[PDB]
Design a protein around this ligand. Sequence first.
Ligand SMILES: [Zn+2]
Lengths: 99, 967, 105
Amino acid sequence: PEEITADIPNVGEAALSKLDESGIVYIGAEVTGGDILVGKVTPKGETQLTPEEKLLRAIFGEKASDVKDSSLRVPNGVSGTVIDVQVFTRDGVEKDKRA
Amino acid sequence: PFTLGQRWISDTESELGLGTVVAVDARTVTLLFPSTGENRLYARSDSPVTRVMFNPGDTITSHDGWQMQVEEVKEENGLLTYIGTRLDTEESGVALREVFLDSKLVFSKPQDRLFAGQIDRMDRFALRYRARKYSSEQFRMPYSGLRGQRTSLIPHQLNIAHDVGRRHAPRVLLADEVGLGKTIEAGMILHQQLLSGAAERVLIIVPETLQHQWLVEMLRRFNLRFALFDDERYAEAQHDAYNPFDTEQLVICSLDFARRSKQRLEHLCEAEWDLLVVDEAHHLVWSEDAPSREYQAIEQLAEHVPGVLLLTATPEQLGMESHFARLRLLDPNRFHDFAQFVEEQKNYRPVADAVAMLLAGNKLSNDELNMLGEMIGEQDIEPLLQAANSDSEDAQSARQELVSMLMDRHGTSRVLFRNTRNGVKGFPKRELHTIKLPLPTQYQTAIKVSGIMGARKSAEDRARDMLYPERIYQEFEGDNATWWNFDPRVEWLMGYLTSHRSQKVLVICAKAATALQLEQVLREREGIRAAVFHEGMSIIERDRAAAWFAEEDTGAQVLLCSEIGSEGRNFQFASHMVMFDLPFNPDLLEQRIGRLDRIGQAHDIQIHVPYLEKTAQSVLVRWYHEGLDAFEHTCPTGRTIYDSVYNDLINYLASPDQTEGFDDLIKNCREQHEALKAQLEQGRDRLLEIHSNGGEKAQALAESIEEQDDDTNLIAFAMNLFDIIGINQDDRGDNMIVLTPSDHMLVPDFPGLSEDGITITFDREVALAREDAQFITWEHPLIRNGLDLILSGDTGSSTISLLKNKALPVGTLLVELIYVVEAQAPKQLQLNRFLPPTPVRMLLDKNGNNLAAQVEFETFNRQLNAVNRHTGSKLVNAVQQDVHAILQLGEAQIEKSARALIDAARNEADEKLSAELSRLEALRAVNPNIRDDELTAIESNRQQVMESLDQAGWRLDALRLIVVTHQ
Amino acid sequence: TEEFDAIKIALASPDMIRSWSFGEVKKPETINYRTFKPERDGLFCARIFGPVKDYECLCGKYKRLKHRGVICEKCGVEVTQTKVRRERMGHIELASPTAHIWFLK
Ligand SMILES: [Zn+2]
């Protein structure tokens, strides 16, 4: 399953600054084209990391599961304020902070 | 034209050798490679396969092992039969069907690849030639091993690395002051010993809590991947080898791990380590009558490893006598009796003092000076001795010659380096700024209740709680109470930041929780960008936060959370810091201020301490500034006075109402401070510090490196190299390139590369600000790796090109010939300082005239262009009879150019190797720490160098054919 | 790009159609809808039409550019640039000779 977490591979902390811990923009934040609208992570499988790389991953905290980002971004050239956010979970899904 | 039985080679993986057509279908052909027995099937179209036929003059070998000489080959029904003279039997007219050729037909010196069909590209030939030139020139650079490390260019560090990294089997004790970079100098010395080839196997023994730190420090700063050996790893390596320590060249392990079993320590002592490094060796207590069971395992190790580096500290204001226990491990025969060392240090102590008076600008009584005169056992001391003291014109140079001679007479300084924070320049000054804020009533009311209810509880815990009001306001105003709304410190912080938006500010607080609350409040009430740096985060995330903080003007304005620190590369661009709180003990206070107070900062430090009126903060500010002078000056008095005052001062913290006796405690603290400072400055072995910091020659080396570090040709060669190999280089823009492999990369795996990519920077300052990037230099493994990959492979060694020039005759022949002069010697000898693989370019004409001295490579290459695969293929064979005659033309001149190069190189070798051997002989006549093994090693190295150089050879590396057309 | 002229049109003979085609598509399946690798034989097939990704075989034994004509022994896909997957045609062997609707209606 893909994840909505705010931990998104190889994004600068600039992009996360406007995101809460759950990974959703704050209500009332002003965004611009290319800004990350919401955080999403694409899963990676059959990583087959080398044993020294696996040891490096444990100390560094690098996630084999991530390495790809499916995060939605504000469309190019549209800029406004986030006035409202809604979250719809199915059965067996934990409620996020925003929820 | 594939037909069963023909011999073909691969243009790229010729390491497979010859192949044989064994099947054919509509689209594909199959080659068997008898070298391995595998078959590879290729599509006929685009035909990346090579016809194997031979010409008159070639020598070939048959499957029965005999060889022969080909003169003519017939072809019938697609098959070749070679006709010629078998040389071992002298039989003429011998036939050999091509199916019976051996596989050991490797990519011969390119005069054979002319008839291989499609030839390689011309930009890979360009990369090949440029690569050999740059690698050759860089191997001989004087300061190799001193630019690729991810450190600031601090003179004393580079000096220590230069001195120690070039010794043979170095055995030294690093007793640098705490916080100066002991592990940094250690890593630099390791980088030198590994890069120079002097060492291949290394063992570092570290306490477990620091093992990961070493793993990251050596990996991120020095590009060295160490293998950590724990019990699990030890077992999995026991399975893979008789000796587990044979599977990896570089090994980290714990000293507690080292002592587990005896068979373990013996396997370790037999693993044939070239170097052993043990940090914090002062934890090894040793008595001559009773050595501890801990010291005994290292004493067993340091005898089985030639070079051994011990990193240690020298605390509690004691002398190097405490160090004897470890010096005994370096040279057990030279240092074998405590008392003699005691006599030496006591009788030199007055001499050291008198020297300190000399260089301090004092006069030295005759009674004093005839004790140094006793030390330097000569007779012409007097004339040079007096000019230095009378302040004549050359009193400076006479002082410098005296100190130079003094260092050679120091009893330990060749084997002991002690840099002090007083003997090293470059540190920024530190100015303090205090701000008195009114303690808000919400805190007074919340704490007085705990005060009343706190009837029976020790003052120690009253002061530990009352230190941080935020976390007692969470018991009476409820947990998570919004204290970040009335606390005046927050308003002061915001006001200062919003009034100084163009300044990066380092803000230190006690606990990570308060740091998260601070980020939230600065954001939701002033929009201040602040990254948190706490212990709970992973290494990559904290690195990400440092990255954000490093953005010149678009990133985080603020930072920071709890102690953690430990970030080797520092915030050299940040010069203003605010202490949102103050720590309890002075060691954490001075280390926190240390994180920034480093050599290489932008400007002086401004320290701002906003503290609440009438609380423990108000006490501690007064204690630290007026009493210890710990903010504006760095003298390490804090711990002693802190221990001598602890129990008294606690009462002054837990109850700031009792004011009498405080101001006298402060004067007592300042008195102790002055006494400790005086005793320490009068205990300074300023000679040892001058020998340690390297002086003016070391600062000159450091600035030569600071100027070599602006090499733009490096970046321009790098881009070409990678792009040719097929590595996508996305330019993020802020001096950071992101390298990612590509679908068209040229090698199965790149050793360092991963599909997710790596970020690099060529600027040392960006690297010091962005530890997530690889600091690329000529000595960086990525470049050395690609270099070995290209110069070992055969791509870029052969191509053809046409030239359209009206100012030349039609059909003229120019031949670019790149010979390579090489020596065969073990890398341990470090022959590459004097003769790396060296290119010899020659631009021959139809008459064998060399133009290379007149015709530079680039200018000639610019106006040249390549051909198409097919026409060019046999266009090469159009001059097969000519080029063969062109080669011998240069054959007679290459030996002249070679003998010039060899003679000059052997000359440079004998001068420097005799000058260093002479210096070492002078030292043995002047210093007792030089071992016989050392001098024997240098003599044998000189002899072996002259011998291996006397047998150096040449070889044809590259060959480009040029034919002028006007079509 | 060649310098050409005269575009010629005529009936395709079955041997010419066999000439253009690189392989037979035996089963109508295309992809596993679960793992998006193409079918071993199908309307999207790496061994017939070309490698999905530039210069790397399906099973992943050979991925480097050094190899440009090799055809992986496990997966019969040749290693070349994925652009070729744009030009390679396949063919189907019909059991019953079938009429061309254009030339009839
Ligand atoms: Zn495959």
